[PDB]
Amino acid sequence: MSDLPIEFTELVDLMSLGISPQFLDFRSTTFESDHFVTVRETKDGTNSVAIVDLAKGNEVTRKNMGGDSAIMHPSQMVISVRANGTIVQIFNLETKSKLKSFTLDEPVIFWRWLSETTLGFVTARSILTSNVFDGNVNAKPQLLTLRHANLNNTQIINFVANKNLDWFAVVGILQENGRIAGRIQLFSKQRNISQAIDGHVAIFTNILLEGNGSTPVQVFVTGNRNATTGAGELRIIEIDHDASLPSQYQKETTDIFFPPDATNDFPIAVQVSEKYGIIYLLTKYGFIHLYELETGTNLFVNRITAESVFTAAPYNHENGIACINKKGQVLAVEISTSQIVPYILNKLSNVALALIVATRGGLPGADDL
Amino acid sequence: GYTLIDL
Amino acid sequence: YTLIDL
Amino acid sequence: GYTLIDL
């Protein structure tokens, strides 16, 4: 279908790799980038991990493991395992060498790579970071801040940071009104202050605005669904505006459409193409929502899977989104560079937006305007 | 999978 | 504390 | 000695 503003792909079917569907869940099958999928496979105490290398032909490396949780680095051949709440060990798979080894003061509830350099930890009470590649094997993670009370009684599902590693957001969900509500702790390290807000998804990104040259402004992108009314909302807002810059970002608020009877749905991931200024917002039930970043305008709504999504990641040099569904398909979406401008011009009937997107991305389709 | 995400 | 308008 | 994963 040649009008679609996106390309939709299956990167791999995990089930065709002999992997069991019993481990397709958020804790057991981890997905930090579209480079690797790590599956924790439980069979008695004869426990194991299957590492799928998406770059190298879906090659699986399988190892016995004594840990309860395992993640791969976004790019490097580095695996992180934790056990018994508090025991953490990180290895260079290639040399077999141990990068980090320590025992934490409090059990880890959630972890993920915040960047290529920094691993984030959330405990019952605390939020911690580790500069894993400092060459100090036994150096323990540094306290970032205590958890805000708004995250009490939630399941921790995300921890994100900006590139500068001085703004952060932790996301927890809980059942309210028989539906999923989300709570976010936002933390500014420079101010040493936290703020509690409502939401299910969060990401820090950057945008180049006319008249600021080649200097980005930073924006936070967050999406919520109200657990009582069902109303969905995306917000985009500036953080730490650099004063010399003459263009700044005016906050945007845009609807996220959920069918009223989509009782159990909520936003489950958000990823941004900084190059193209495109937000990808994915829901648990498999709905994809595209937004343009400058204007917050909704571009597209559709569904890419009928099976629920349980984990997601950036795709293709962070210009798209990838996800894994309950049937074990790894699915991917990114804009079609050749079709997105005609789509905006002619389907959305929106000349000004088409020119915004064409200009930012160097894309075709606006050359007869 | 016994998390709300998995439910 | 109100860091930002959300 | 102890490793959480057997490489």
Residue numbers in the entry:
A (entry chain A): 1 to 369
B (entry chain M), D (entry chain G): 1 to 7
C (entry chain E): 2 to 7
Please quote the paper that reports this structure.
The protein that gives the process its name, Clathrin, is a triskelion composed of three heavy chains (Clathrin Heavy Chain, Chc) that provide the structural backbone of the lattice, further stabilized and regulated by three light chains (Clathrin Light Chain, Clc). The proximal domain specifically interacts with Clcs, whereas, the N-terminal domain (NTD) of Chc, which adopts a WD40 beta-propeller structure, is pivotal for interactions with various adaptor proteins (APs). To investigate the existence of binding sites present in Clathrin NTD, we crystallized the N-terminal domain of Chc with different peptides derived from adaptor proteins containing CBMs. All our structures show that each peptide binds to three different binding pockets (Clathrin, Arrestin and W-box).
Crystal structure of Chc-NTD (displayed as a grey cartoon) bound to CBMs from Ent1 (1.75 Å, red), Ent2 (1.74 Å, yellow), Ent5 (Ent5.1 LIDL motif, 2.01 Å, green), Apl2.1 (Apl2.1 LLDLF motif, 2.75 Å, blue) and Yap1801 (1.95 Å, grey). For the Ent1 and Ent2 complexes, a water molecule bridges the interaction between the carbonyl oxygen at the motif’s +3 position and N64. Water-mediated interactions are also observed in the W-box between the NTD backbone (L24, D25 and V309) and the peptide at position +3, for both Ent1 and Ent2. Residue K284 within the W-box establishes salt bridges with the carboxy-terminal of Ent1, Ent2 and Yap1801. Mutation of the Clathrin box showed a reduction of almost seven-fold in the binding affinity to Ent1 (KDApp WT ≅ 138 µM vs. KDApp Cla ≅ 968 µM), while Ent2 exhibits a three-fold increase in its dissociation constant (KDApp Cla ≅ 509 µM). This data confirms Ent1’s binding preference towards the Clathrin box. Mutagenesis experiments conducted on clathrin binding sites revealed a consistent preference of Ent1 for the Clathrin box, with the Arrestin and W-boxes appearing to play a less critical role for Ent1, serving as secondary sites of interaction. Competition experiments conducted at sub saturating concentrations using native MS revealed that Ent1 is able to displace Ent2 but not vice versa. Here, we show that Ent1 binds more efficiently to Chc and therefore can be better recruited than Ent2.
